[PDB]
From Swiss-Prot:
Domain notes: The KIX domain mediates binding to HIV-1 Tat.
Record protein name field: CREB-binding protein
Effect of Y97C: In RSTS1; mild form; impairs binding to ASF1A and acetylated histone H3
Residue segments, region Interaction with histone: 46-92
Covered residues, full protein: 1081 to 1197 of 2442
PTM entry text: Methylation of the KIX domain by CARM1 blocks association with CREB. This results in the blockade of CREB signaling, and in activation of apoptotic response.
Residue numbers spanned by region Interaction with ASF1A: 84-102
Subcellular location: Cytoplasm; Nucleus
Length: 119
C-alpha cells in the first residue's frame, strides 16, 4: 500500500466507464444526478452553503473523458462525494435521497470486480 502504480488515462477510462454507464442506466434513479445541481433553477440558494464540493454524473464523466483521474480511487471518491452530498442535503422522503440510495446499491456491485482488477 506504499507503492502507487501508474495508470494511463485511457486504461482507467476503459475499465471504469462501464461502472459509470451502470449508473446512467438506472432510470428514473439517475435522472437527478445526470447534470449539476442548479440552486438558482431549483430555488435552493443554501445548497452551496451545505454542499461545499458539488458532484454529479456529468462531471465524473467529463473527468474520466478528459484524463483528470490519476488513480481509480479518485473516481470512486467522486462517485461517493455525489452520494454523500445528496444524503447530506435532502430529506429521507425525497426522490433524490431514495434514488441516491439505489445508485449506491448498484455502484457497489459494479465497482468491486473492477477495483480488484485494477489493483
Ligand atoms: C432536489 C434537487 C436536486 C436534484 C435534481 O436533479 N432536481 C431536478 C430533478 C429531480 C428528479 Cl427526482 C428527477 C429529475 C430532475 C431533473 C431536473 C432537476 O432540477 N438533483 C440533486 C442531486 C438535488 C439535490 C438538492 O441534491
Amino acid at each position: 500500500s506504499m507503492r502507487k502504480k501508474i495508470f494511463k488515462p485511457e486504461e482507467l477510462r476503459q475499465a471504469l466507464m462501464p461502472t459509470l454507464e451502470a449508473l446512467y442506466r438506472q432510470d428514473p434513479e439517475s435522472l437527478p444526478f445526470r447534470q449539476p445541481v442548479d440552486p438558482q433553477l431549483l430555488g435552493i440558494p443554501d445548497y452551496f452553503d451545505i454542499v461545499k464540493n458539488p458532484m454529479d454524473l456529468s462531471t465524473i464523466k467529463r473527468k474520466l473523458d478528459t484524463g483528470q483521474y490519476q488513480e481509480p480511487w479518485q473516481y470512486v471518491d467522486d462517485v461517493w462525494l455525489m452520494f454523500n452530498n445528496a444524503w447530506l442535503y435532502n430529506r429521507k422522503t425525497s426522490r433524490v435521497y431514495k434514488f441516491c440510495s439505489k445508485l449506491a446499491e448498484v455502484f457497489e456491485q459494479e465497482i468491486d470486480p473492477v477495483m480488484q482488477s485494477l489493483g
